[PDB]
RNA sequence: CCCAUAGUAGGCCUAAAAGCAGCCACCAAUUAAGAAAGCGUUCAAGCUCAACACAUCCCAAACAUAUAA
């Protein structure tokens, strides 16, 4: 079975030094650079629940991808019988 | 692709599918190319190959097939449907396969 | 065919689960663990690494290594050792957006993204969806103080849930 | 307003109308005039 | 009309199609509004199984039916003509629209039972050994129900069961 | 039959048309190929090599492209598209890099390439590579 | 998502006997003809008594086939009250045009029709699964047939005027039924 | 008809649950492809679909086509 090493839990260290970010034994956790250096879009990423069709712009690729997923779901529900 | 894939290009040696894409009457030949170029149809005989060349001289699309014991078969796509070429082609190779073994 | 089974770095085992899989193919088993353990030597022993095996009909095998799963990155990035039992109702961990971006950076170097050939923005957009599955909430400006109280309560709550699980284990032994 | 048809590979090369018109004008111009023109063109390249 | 050919010469076979002129539709249909050929010519409900001149136009040289898309017939008329062609064949009205006989087959003479308005293929039908009582009598179908709407020039409607 | 009112264009249809209005703008050269029969694993490596050569392989329905070509200046592009089609785009003209990879797959034919805002046949495209 | 499932989605159990009349199954139903908080239902097209045995069959089938979260079912039939002496057993009379069972929730008629229609064929009387749109089309279609009927002679006109002394061979109830209902059996095609 | 790449084998549990004993989720890459609608697995895999592109012995005889009386 798969075994994972225990993660040391210090609040300051975890934020500054993520163990997961570093995968090699020789390397060390990657520190976080100032916020300004990081891309602005990172801060604009959506953290909320999946947007409904009304929220999404109608003429947008995501809107019709969401519409397509919903339509396939509708077929799934009908196909449940067989 | 499915139909031919069941048969397999065993007794064939090479194919030729010359067509001028600009010409309107090349639709049938290109559809024929898809079937023969199908991985399922081709994989059957890695040794066997296919030529699908492309030109812009205005020549009518032509399909020429190379075999071993069987004589070469040439089909002109301009006045042939893709299904008729495939079914007639499959019949020819089947007879050649019987002759070989 | 092709076999893609996640294997911990340097912990490849001839026995199950990957063991019997190789036996059916007929490819050498010991050779895999030998080459794999020697190829992931630098990587920490125990890192979830998706591995793809290119098996020819001749049974010749060419191993393929990828970047670790997103779960491992996010988990440690918060300090959490085990994800949440329930999603949306409890928060497993607290990671900044930076942490999601840092994982996206090193995670975009894998084979999957090369094929997916998407931009940097999409990379993060796909890791925020995994963190939610784990329960890990992302906050623009998390603070050490907030992190300390949140993690401490979760750890104690996880111990309480572990105690409930332990009680169920006793019932399972009874039945 | 519409792109011209691709020439056949066998067919001789076809040249845009503008290119053909320019060739005729160069011959009429004197070498001394051409020499003055040539000097300005070289500077633009570098 | 496209006739595929094949010529084996010089140890090679060439397959090519030949486009030939076809029979043009008669000019000025009486009712140009009609969607399909039958209504366009005021022929709806006005043709029977023995109108070979009308039915022959919608069948292949070997007696097979032509697709609806190619002919343009509406689904209702397509099924009517399809049944009429079946009865026309079974009655011997179309003796030149049969598959060509190759060299292998031998000319043979077998019982030629004259029949007409045959709804079912002779082989499939089974004898009516028990007719049954008068209130529940097993009848013998004659003609087709699809032609029940045909123009009737008599005070008695067609009997479809005998 | 009563003529039906014209069907409204789906938003996806507009999105596909909007994408086309950027392909030519973004990538100077767009190439058309027809053989999609190639296996997925070979296809994946083909795109991966294209990325190594800064080229992108994408497939779009001709249902929307065909009307656009009739309206766009490249009307002569329309005949090439038939059945299954795919597009290769690269802002920088990596013509030689593309051609040498296509040569490795005989059953995959390059119908034509629209480069430098000019419809060029495959035979002429080779000369351009040199 | 707007629809809300009650705390008890699956159909509740029906008592075999009450805790404590051939006309009952004859004619059009005057109650339970309209959907209540449910789009789909099983429409009774005939008149027959329902003993507990049927209730257990319908409840078992509907419950297992239906998904609790997706949809809910509400009983429209009361408990068996009529005494049948061979009391040997208790039954529930259902008149024609009555909705025996109703199905409402996050589902479509095609999804619902499958199990509802299957249960319907078991009922001792003719029944067909119906939906709001379907049932309204059924009633709207019936009204269209009456208005556009080309026959100048109708059962109601002949029966009400007693033309040909027809009332000698007809029941008094036929004046209200108008020939659509013959005993327990109901004839939909009749105008 | 066509064809179904993949994060990843989602988390949690499950000896085992890899779309698919269950639970919780049902987010996402691609122009597109349901954490999955079936079938199928010890679990996998495999196979389709939704997507992309394209009880002596039957019982009148008969009859379809001449203006309902
Ligand atoms: S549509 Fe008029 S007869 Fe076919």
**C26 contacts: CB under 8 Å, gap ≥ 6:** C59
- Across the interface, of B72, B84, B85, the residue whose CB is closest to E12 is B72
Judging contacts by C-beta atoms under 8 Å, the chain E residues touching residue B85 are 15
Taking Cα atoms as reference points, which of B51, B40, B39 lies closest to residue B13?
Answer: B51
Task: Tell how far CA F83 is from the center of its chain.
Answer: 13
CATH of the domain at C120: 1.10.10.250
Determined by cryo-EM
> What does the alpha-carbon distance between residue A64 and residue A60 come to, in Å, rounded to a whole number?
7
> What does the alpha-carbon distance between residue B90 and residue B95 come to, in Å, rounded to a whole number?
9
| Helices C70-78 & C120-134 angle (0-180, nearest 10) | 70
**Which helix (H) or strand (E) segment is G94 a member of?**
strand G89-94
- Check F11 against A59: CB less than 8 A apart: yes
> Does residue F115 sit in helix, strand or coil?
strand
Beta partners for residue B67, in sequence order:
B12
Residue of E32, E46, E74, E147 to mutate, ligand 1, most atoms within 8 A of C-beta = E74
Residue F70 DSSP label:
H
Residue C21 forms part of a structural domain = yes
Q: Which nucleotide is nearest to E142 (CA to C1')?
A: H64
Q: Which nucleotide is nearest to C126 (CA to C1')?
A: H28
Residue E65 DSSP label:
B
C5 & C54 share domain = yes
**B85 contacts: CB under 8 Å, gap ≥ 6:** B28, B29, B32, B63, B75, B77, E15
Sign (positive or negative) of CA dihedral C16, C17, C18, C22 = positive
- The DSSP secondary structure of F5-19, one letter per residue, reads PPPPPPHHHHHHHHH
> Assign residue C153 a region: left if phi > 0, alpha if psi is -120 to 50, beta otherwise?
alpha
Chains C and F touch (3+ CB pairs under 8 A): yes
The phi and psi torsions of B54 (rounded to 5 degrees) equal -140, 135
Beta partners for residue E7, in sequence order:
E14
**Which helix (H) or strand (E) segment is G158 a member of?**
helix G155-161
Long-range contacts, F69-76 (Cβ 8 Å, 24+): F72/F20, F73/D1, F73/D2, F73/D3, F74/D3, F74/F114, F74/F119, F75/D2, F75/D3, F76/B22, F76/D3, F76/D4, F76/D5, F76/D6, F76/F119
Do C28 and C62 contact (CB within 8 A), yes or no? no
Sign (positive or negative) of CA dihedral F80, F83, F88, F89 = positive
**A37 contacts: CB under 8 Å, gap ≥ 6:** none
Do G159 and G167 contact (CB within 8 A), yes or no? yes
**Which helix (H) or strand (E) segment is G91 a member of?**
strand G89-94
Q: Helices in chain C by DSSP H: which ranges?
A: 18-25, 30-39, 70-78, 97-107, 111-116, 120-134, 144-174
Distance F60 CA to H1 C1' (A): 19
∠ CA G86-G91-G97, rounded to 5°: 135
C16 & C61 share domain = yes
CA end-to-end span of chain F: 59
Residue C146 forms part of a structural domain = no
∠ CA F39-F44-F48, rounded to 5°: 150
Task: Tell how far CA E72 is from the center of its chain.
Answer: 16
> What does the alpha-carbon distance between residue G127 and residue G188 come to, in Å, rounded to a whole number?
12
Which residue's CA is the closest to the ligand 1 atom numbered 3?
E39
Residue E42 near ligand 1, beta carbon < 6 Å = no
> What does the alpha-carbon distance between residue B65 and residue B15 come to, in Å, rounded to a whole number?
4
Do B33 and B52 contact (CB within 8 A), yes or no? yes
Residue C166 forms part of a structural domain = no
Distances (CA, A) of C27 to C13, C14, C39, F54, G139: 15, 12, 18, 37, 71
Residue C109: which domain range? 67-140
Bridge-based pairing state of the strands B62-67 and B12-18: antiparallel
Dihedral over alpha carbons C161, C166, C169, C173 (to 10 degrees): -160
What are the domain boundaries of chain G? 8-191
C104 & C45 share domain = no
**Which helix (H) or strand (E) segment is E84 a member of?**
helix E75-90
> What does the alpha-carbon distance between residue G19 and residue G14 come to, in Å, rounded to a whole number?
11
**Which helix (H) or strand (E) segment is F89 a member of?**
strand F86-90
Task: Tell how far CA G146 is from the center of its chain.
Answer: 22
C74 & C62 share domain = no
- The DSSP secondary structure of F39-64, one letter per residue, reads -HHHHHHHHHHHHHTT-EEE---HHH
> Assign residue G5 a region: left if phi > 0, alpha if psi is -120 to 50, beta otherwise?
beta
CA end-to-end span of chain B: 24
∠ CA G179-G183-G188, rounded to 5°: 50
Do D6 and F119 contact (CB within 8 A), yes or no? yes
Number of structural domains chain C divides into: 2
Residue F8: which domain range? 1-130
> What does the alpha-carbon distance between residue A39 and residue C104 come to, in Å, rounded to a whole number?
12
Determine whether F70 is exposed, middle or buried from the number of CB atoms within 10 Å of its CB (0-12, 13-18, 19+): exposed
Q: Which nucleotide is nearest to C107 (CA to C1')?
A: H7
b (16+ CB within 10 A) / e for E105-144: eeeeeeeeeeeebbbeeeeeeeeeeeeeeeeeeeeeeebb
Task: Tell how far CA G19 is from the center of its chain.
Answer: 25
Dihedral over alpha carbons B43, B44, B48, B49 (to 10 degrees): -30
The phi and psi torsions of D25 (rounded to 5 degrees) equal -70, -35
Determine whether E102 is exposed, middle or buried from the number of CB atoms within 10 Å of its CB (0-12, 13-18, 19+): exposed
Taking Cα atoms as reference points, which of B29, B3, B34, B9 lies closest to residue B18?
Answer: B29
**A46 contacts: CB under 8 Å, gap ≥ 6:** C125, C128
> What does the alpha-carbon distance between residue G33 and residue G132 come to, in Å, rounded to a whole number?
11
Taking Cα atoms as reference points, which of C38, C36, C41 lies closest to residue C6?
Answer: C36
What are the E-state strand segments in E43-87? none
- Number of Cβ within a 10 Å radius of residue B9: 23
> Does residue E86 sit in helix, strand or coil?
helix
> What does the alpha-carbon distance between residue E49 and residue E91 come to, in Å, rounded to a whole number?
9
Residue C33 forms part of a structural domain = yes
Q: Which of B44, B46, B47, B56 is the best residue to mutate to test the F interface, defined by the most F CB atoms within 10 Å of its own CB?
A: B56
> What does the alpha-carbon distance between residue G123 and residue G117 come to, in Å, rounded to a whole number?
10
Taking Cα atoms as reference points, which of C80, C90, C93 lies closest to residue C131?
Answer: C93
Q: What is the 3-state secondary structure (H, E, C) of chain B?
A: CHHHHHHCCCCEEEEEEEECCCCHHHHHHHHHHHHHHCHHHHHCCCCCCCECCECCCCCCCEEEEEECCCCEEEEEHHHCCHHHHHHHHHHHHHHHHHHHC
> What does the alpha-carbon distance between residue F41 and residue C62 come to, in Å, rounded to a whole number?
15
Number of structural domains chain F divides into: 1
> Assign residue A43 a region: left if phi > 0, alpha if psi is -120 to 50, beta otherwise?
alpha
Distances (CA, A) of B99 to B48, B69, B85, B95, G105: 18, 8, 21, 6, 67
Determine whether G8 is exposed, middle or buried from the number of CB atoms within 10 Å of its CB (0-12, 13-18, 19+): exposed
Taking Cα atoms as reference points, which of G130, G119, G149, G107 lies closest to residue G9?
Answer: G107
- The DSSP secondary structure of G7-47, one letter per residue, reads S--SPPP--SS----GGGGSSB--SS-S-SS-SEEEEE-B-
> What does the alpha-carbon distance between residue B29 and residue B82 come to, in Å, rounded to a whole number?
6
**G157 contacts: CB under 8 Å, gap ≥ 6:** G163
Task: Tell how far CA F70 is from the center of its chain.
Answer: 16
Longest distance between any two alpha carbons in chain E, whole Å: 75
CATH of the domain at F112: 3.30.70.1730
Distances (CA, A) of A36 to A17, C98, C125, D7, E21: 19, 11, 20, 56, 77
A75 reaches G (C-beta below 8 A): no
Bridge-based pairing state of the strands F118-121 and G99-105: unpaired
Dihedral over alpha carbons C143, C148, C149, C153 (to 10 degrees): 140
> Assign residue B45 a region: left if phi > 0, alpha if psi is -120 to 50, beta otherwise?
beta
- β-sheet with C61-65: strand ranges across: C2-8, C48-55, C61-65
Residue C105 forms part of a structural domain = yes
Residue G125 DSSP label:
S
> What does the alpha-carbon distance between residue C144 and residue C154 come to, in Å, rounded to a whole number?
15
Instruction: Find the chain B residues whose C-beta atoms sit closer than 8 A to any C-beta of E.
Output: 71-76, 78-80, 84-85, 88, 92
> Assign residue E117 a region: left if phi > 0, alpha if psi is -120 to 50, beta otherwise?
left
Residue E44 near ligand 1, beta carbon < 6 Å = yes
A80 reaches G (C-beta below 8 A): yes
Residue C83 DSSP label:
-
> What does the alpha-carbon distance between residue G54 and residue G11 come to, in Å, rounded to a whole number?
14
Do B73 and B17 contact (CB within 8 A), yes or no? no
- Number of Cβ within a 10 Å radius of residue E156: 6
Do F66 and F78 contact (CB within 8 A), yes or no? yes
The phi and psi torsions of G27 (rounded to 5 degrees) equal 100, 175
Residue C156 forms part of a structural domain = no
Determine whether C94 is exposed, middle or buried from the number of CB atoms within 10 Å of its CB (0-12, 13-18, 19+): buried
Give the end of a domain, one of C66, C100, C121.
Answer: C66
- The DSSP secondary structure of C87-108, one letter per residue, reads TTTS---EE-HHHHHHHHHHHT
Determine whether F67 is exposed, middle or buried from the number of CB atoms within 10 Å of its CB (0-12, 13-18, 19+): middle
Taking Cα atoms as reference points, which of B46, A55, A82 lies closest to residue G110?
Answer: A82
**B50 contacts: CB under 8 Å, gap ≥ 6:** B14, B15, B16, B17, B36, B37, B42, F106, F107
* CA within 13 Å, CB half, G28: 11
């Amino acid at each position: 079975a798969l075994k994972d090493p225990d993660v040391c839990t210090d609040p300051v260290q975890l934020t500054t030094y993520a163990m997961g970010v570093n995968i090699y034994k020789e390397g060390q956790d990657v520190p976080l650079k100032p916020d300004a250096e990081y891309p602005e879009w990172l801060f604009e990423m959506n953290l909320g629940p999946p947007k409904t069709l009304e929220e999404l712009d109608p003429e947008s690729r995501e809107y019709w991808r969401r519409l397509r997923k919903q339509n396939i779901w509708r077929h799934n529900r009908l196909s449940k019988n067989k | 692709a499915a139909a031919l894939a069941r048969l397999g290009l065993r007794p064939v040696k090479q194919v030729r599918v010359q067509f001028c894409p600009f010409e309107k009457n090349v639709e049938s030949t290109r559809t024929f190319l898809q079937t023969v170029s199908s991985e399922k149809v081709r994989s059957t005989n890695l040794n066997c190959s296919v030529i699908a060349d492309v030109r812009h001289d205005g020549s009518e699309p032509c399909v020429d097939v190379l075999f071993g014991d069987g004589h070469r078969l040439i089909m002109r796509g301009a006045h042939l449907t893709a299904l008729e070429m495939l079914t007639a082609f499959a019949s020819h190779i089947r007879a050649r396969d019987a002759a070989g073994s | 065919g092709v076999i893609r089974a996640i294997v911990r770095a340097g912990l490849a085992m001839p026995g199950p689960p990957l063991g019997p899989v190789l036996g059916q193919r007929g490819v050498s088993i010991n050779q895999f663990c030998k080459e794999f353990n020697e190829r992931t030597k630098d990587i920490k022993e125990g890192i979830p690494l998706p591995t793809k095996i290119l098996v020819k009909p001749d049974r010749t095998f060419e191993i393929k290594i990828g970047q670790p799963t997103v779960s491992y990155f996010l988990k440690a990035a918060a300090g959490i050792e085990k994800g949440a039992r329930q999603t949306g109702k409890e928060v497993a961990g607290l990671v900044t957006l930076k942490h999601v971006y840092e994982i996206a950076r090193i995670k975009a170097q894998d084979e999957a993204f090369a094929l997916q050939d998407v931009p940097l923005s999409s990379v993060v957009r796909s890791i925020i969806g995994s963190a939610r599955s784990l329960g890990i909430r992302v906050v623009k400006d998390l603070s050490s103080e907030e992190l300390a109280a949140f993690q401490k309560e979760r750890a104690i709550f996880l111990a309480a849930q572990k105690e409930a699980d332990l009680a169920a284990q006793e019932e399972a032994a009874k039945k | 307003e519409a792109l011209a048809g691709a020439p056949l590979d066998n067919a001789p090369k076809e040249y845009p109308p503008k290119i053909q018109q320019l060739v005729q004008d160069i011959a009429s111009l004197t070498l001394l005039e051409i020499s003055d023109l040539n000097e300005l063109l070289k500077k633009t390249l570098k | 009309f496209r006739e595929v050919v094949e010529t084996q010469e010089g140890k090679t076979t060439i397959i090519e199609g030949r486009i030939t002129a076809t029979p043009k539709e008669s000019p000025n249909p009486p009712n140009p509004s009609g969607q399909c050929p039958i209504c366009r010519w005021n022929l709806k409900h006005k043709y029977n199984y023995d109108d070979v001149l009308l039915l022959s136009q919608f069948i292949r040289p070997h007696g097979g039916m032509l697709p609806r898309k190619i002919t343009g017939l509406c689904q209702e008329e397509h099924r009517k003509i399809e049944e009429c062609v079946k009865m026309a064949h079974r009655a011997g009205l179309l003796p030149n629209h049969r598959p060509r006989l190759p060299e292998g087959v031998v000319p043979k003479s077998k019982p030629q039972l004259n029949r007409y308005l045959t709804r079912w293929a002779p082989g499939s039908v089974k004898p009516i050994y028990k007719k049954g009582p008068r209130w529940n009598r097993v009848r013998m179908p004659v003609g087709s129900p699809l032609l029940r709407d045909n123009v009737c020039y008599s005070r008695t409607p067609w009997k479809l069961y005998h | 039959s009563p003529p039906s009112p014209p069907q409204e264009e789906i938003g996806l249809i507009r999105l596909l048309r909007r994408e086309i209005a950027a392909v030519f703008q973004d990538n100077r050269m767009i190439a058309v190929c027809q053989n999609v029969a190639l296996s997925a694993e070979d296809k994946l490596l083909m795109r991966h090599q294209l990325r190594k050569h800064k080229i992108l392989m994408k497939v779009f329905p001709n249902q929307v492209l065909k009307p656009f070509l009739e309206d766009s200046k490249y009307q002569n592009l329309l005949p090439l598209f038939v059945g299954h089609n795919m597009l290769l785009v690269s802002e920088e003209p990596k013509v030689k890099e593309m051609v040498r990879i296509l040569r490795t797959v005989p059953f995959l034919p390059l119908l034509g390439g629209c480069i430098d805002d000019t419809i060029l046949s495959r035979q002429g495209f080779i000369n351009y590579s040199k | 998502e707007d629809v809300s499932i009650p705390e008890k989605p699956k159909l509740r159990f029906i008592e075999r006997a009450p805790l404590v009349n051939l006309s009952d199954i004859r004619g059009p139903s005057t109650e339970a003809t309209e959907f209540t908080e449910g789009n789909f239902a099983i429409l009774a097209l005939g008149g027959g008594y329902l003993h507990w045995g049927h209730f257990e069959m319908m409840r078992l089938t509907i419950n297992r086939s239906m998904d609790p979260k997706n949809m809910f079912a509400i009983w429209r039939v009361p408990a068996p009250f009529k005494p049948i002496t061979r009391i040997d057993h208790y039954v529930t009379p259902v008149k024609a045009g009555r909705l025996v069972v109703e199905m409402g929730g996050r589902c479509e008629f095609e999804e619902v029709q499958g199990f509802l229609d299957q249960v319907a064929h078991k009922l001792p009387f003719a029944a067909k699964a119906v939906s709001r749109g379907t049932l309204e089309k059924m009633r709207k279609d019936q009204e269209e047939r009456e208005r556009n009927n080309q026959n100048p002679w109708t059962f109601e006109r002949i029966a009400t005027a007693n033309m040909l002394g027809i009332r000698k061979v007809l029941s008094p109830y036929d004046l209200t039924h108008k020939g659509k209902y013959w005993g327990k059996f109901y004839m939909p095609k009749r105008v």
